[model samples]
Target: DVPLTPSQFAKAKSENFDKKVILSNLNKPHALLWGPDNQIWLTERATGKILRVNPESGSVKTVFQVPEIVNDADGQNGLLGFAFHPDFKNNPYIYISGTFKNPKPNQTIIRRYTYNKSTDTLEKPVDLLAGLPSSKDHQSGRLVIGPDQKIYYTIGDQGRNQLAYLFLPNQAQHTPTQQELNGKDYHTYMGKVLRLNLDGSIPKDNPSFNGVVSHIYTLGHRNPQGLAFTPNGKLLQSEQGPNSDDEINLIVKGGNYGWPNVAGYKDDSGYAYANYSAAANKSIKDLAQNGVKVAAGVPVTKESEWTGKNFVPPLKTLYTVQDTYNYNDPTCGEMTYICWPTVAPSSAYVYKGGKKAITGWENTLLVPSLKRGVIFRIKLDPTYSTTYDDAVPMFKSNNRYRDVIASPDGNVLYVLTDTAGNVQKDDGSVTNTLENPGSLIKFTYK
Candidate 1:
């Protein structure tokens, strides 16, 4: 176990209360979840360890450690997200998404484990879904059981046009083309939202009826790491972008969210999906030299079958990316350019009205950032009929935040921190080992 770092107190405070460190020296904790048993369950990214912590006493117990979990660790892979059985009382099944080490082609194994309450360990894991795309880049492994009793998970575009992996780890893995191969099967499945039943069976109603891609719920996504269901029964997603244009998407079934092709705004109707290939080429060249530049969007007269034969744009209700990464408008035709800000958004949680601590914070959406080290509080209008009225940053720090969740009683919020605990540069090289053992922080307000 890596030693916990010195009690370096850093927080974001208001007139009512302050955010403080609840625990530290965690081995790259990926998620912080409030379990049904009133214990805090957290997954360590690099070590494949699951610790059950007492929220009141701050004592931690290692309940389980996955046996064959891939330990490549760091920057978007490893022992990632896990979910609880909807009926934990009768069936103790828990689903997990984790990566296997190389010597093995990088892949995510979505499996189920039975939790024995008496022993405090998860055992008898059965493969739920295996051999799914888990890339070196953009592999945000988050698992959640939807309200309909269906299991949902998110996969990114494998850093396709972003050039995060290869020269990338998997060459055939990156493809913007969305056409069904052999006219009946999907050859590519990355950049998608996948759904399945509790027993690891694909829902009959998934987007594709074909055999291979039947599990795909929605396709065409980038680093959409953050996902949560709102109190009003809507699925919300958060993703990272190239320069900027990171997004907060309202998920739709069989929908397509343009990744290597579009960002921020609806490029298809906004005419950004026009001649899209040229922009993809220029995007890499420009990203290499200029980091950010103009003339990025090109023209495309034909529709892409792999963006799925149909596409669904994001709702106007909420937003994550600012306009900074939006190159010239596709209609601009090499005329203008815009550079927005960056917030490497991680996992998200919707408040359920517990503590009523922060006035009006109830029923709001909270997202923590890895790059900015702050929580973005987003308040969405009921029914999602209107656009986002307020979403601001708080809890400022150099601590790279990973995941967050509201307490059962809603009295406190727990946020996870990645071991790469410092602001990442535009170049993507972070060397602050001094902050090696990232802390687990608790937020309380009057």
Candidate 2:
């Protein structure tokens, strides 16, 4: 294990907290949450196991293992996310989503398990939904039980037009046609938020598009991994941008967040849609050289050129820079793209711990960045309509921060680190050597 750097120590000291590694050597922990039973519940993405950790004793035990999950160590496919029933004690049900090989490989399915409280196990699986899209990249597996007692799930654009899947089409704006909807095909569900009843049926009140109503709650999103709600029931989502404009959006029912056409705002300041897949016969290396620019033969569309009636903007962008912003900074050397202005915000949690619990932090949204290895605190206004750029960075480390959660009292914070991934250090370098791989860290307010 590596010791904390001087800057890390200073940051923690200045933030009035003490850091301790609570659980180490986790099997690539991906999701984390503070359970209503005053315990920490997390998922091991690689091992397909659900674990329980006692916050006080730091003892960890395997609670359940998903039987049918198909996992690849190199990809982001595995046991995705889980949510406890709203009245978990009375219902004793836990819903989980994962990648499985049934109808086809990389198919995503959600299942419900009865929680055996006495034996501390999850048993009696019942499938909720199946045939959801899954892929190697951008499989937005965030699941949440909304205040309305319905299940809300997010699906990404499946990493199209970027890396290995560059040639595939981005369907963020596509809603299923009537024919496909009638056949129960989910090909068009990618890059959309789906709202379903507890039993995985499409709610009748779900928003409709083009006279078609299905599970699609909102459309036009890219890699929306973070989903949470404020005490007042405002749904907040944090999504990753291409190379800039990572967004913290206040989700609205039936709202459309522009994906390929817009990144942050419609001003067309620093982002434009560059359809690399349209660059027919262009080699991947040649396309990489023209990063986010109008490459040769690439069909380009400026942010302002595309508009829709249901479009909505985000409350905050991790960064929105000028068009002339440099993507080839010399300090990063060969790792320039990793040093871009954007922060890979993996998850978000709304902190409601009042002044008594955590002074001066009431309705704040805590975002964990996977790239910069820090937590950015964005303070929401009283009405929760907008946010202030407080610019307070917390829990700085040399590990990829996958997700963060807070204790009930709010005096304590728990952070989950990626077991294996590249992360940018504060010194402006990138490395895969994590200081605290697959560990749960606790930071207590001093």
Candidate 3:
């Protein structure tokens, strides 16, 4: 492997690999999707523009621009997530999630659009679902079509946990100090997974009362950016945690995964249990018995007291003391799954069945790290073992690896990188070179 130190950043003109600049001078590029026509579509968060790039010839095109979308685009807003219809070749429908210019302050919308294949452009975007909470951070807008042919999208609490569900009287309001309104009356859709039809319509079988707007599949998430279905059709998600604790969860309908009120597992500082009863002091004890761990809330200090009445726990704990090695410092050279404070992962795709060029990667998972500048390849054992024993690092160049996909033929890998600021390189030393360059680099094995 070529290890380039950041201090020695330079352009990659190496003979060992052929490099092509796809989109340069971008402002925080976020997601990439390969359309049916072999066109690479991507999101530029800062510009609120969707770009199409041709990987074979290095050609670029601006498919659509959402200049009017009211995105903070500073921390985690703007045009964030998208997915093409399963029958995109025939239906040509495109779905997107992002912040909209809400008449009310600090609110956003998630919408979908139709791609006019004839015009090679996107038609007017349609409002799939609106009234999601928006903040400078945690506007988790990652969309994906699961194996079940349903559109699944992730939304963050944006730090406001009360909007997730309708709890009891006082406890339902989340920590009284936390500034969110009460019950379903609250017009926020943060911290939840939404399942919908292609045309912004809720699936008839959705877990909610008929005619209710609760297309919510699951609730209590902080900033889930990565959504994918395993080979077995099991829905899985990766949610961003506060300081540590990024999570990979098995999504279920109407299941409460506990956010703000809980982080890792079940706890008892006066939070409701899965059975929906409030118990103070016994929160942690109850959760421990139920195999849940309290993870959310500020990092516990020596002087901190677990005296609240709304503390629940996370389903599976990440970045916990048990699994610290996954946490890697991007500024340094440590490359692990654990994320840094400001760097949120954008999206992830599972490679189920493809051609031989990507051999040994058939059942692997490809995750795109936004600020970390790399794509993480997590290999799953064919036997479906409980443990994930291998994690291979692919695409280690210095541009922010935004998204990845396999070409239609499955022989080539299309990777999108954000070179807006610049590209960095490894100096074959202690630190990787930090240069201002951006481009889409492809890899084909001999």
In model 3, the Cα lDDT at residue 223 comes to 79
Clashes of each: 12, 0, 37
lDDT of candidate 1 over 200-316, digit per residue (tens): 666867665333446678777777788888766788888775554567778888666766455555432222222223454444333321122324443333223224444555542
Give per-residue lDDT, candidate 2, residue 364: 87
TM-scores, all candidates, are: 0.79, 0.94, 0.71
TM-score order, best first, reads 2, 1, 3
| Residue ranges of candidate 3 with Cα displaced over 4 Å | 1-20, 160-188, 208-213, 261-318, 322-344, 381-387, 419-438
- Model 2 lDDT per residue over 1-446, tens place: 11234354236323588899998889889899888687999998887899999998999889889987888877888998788998987898988889898654678888899999788798999888888888888888899999999999988888887777877788888898889888878898888888999999989999998889989999889999899989999899999987777888988989999986788777687777777777765563433422455556677788888856689988877677777767677766677766677778898889979444788787788888887778878788877888875435677777888889888888889999998777776677777888998899998999
Highest lDDT scorer: 2
Superposed on all Cα atoms, model 3 deviates from the true structure by an RMSD in Å of 8.7
The residue-by-residue lDDT of candidate 3 on 183-286, one tens digit each, is: 42234455777787766566878765222435567766777878887778767666765444456566777666656445444423222223212323222222
Candidate 1 to truth, TM: 0.79
Candidate 3 lDDT trough over 10 residues, lowest sum? 169-178
Instruction: Give me the runs in candidate 1 sitting further than 4 Å from their true place.
Output: 1-15, 101-104, 164-187, 209-213, 267-309, 315-340, 355-357, 424-437
Residue 388 of model 2, lDDT score: 72
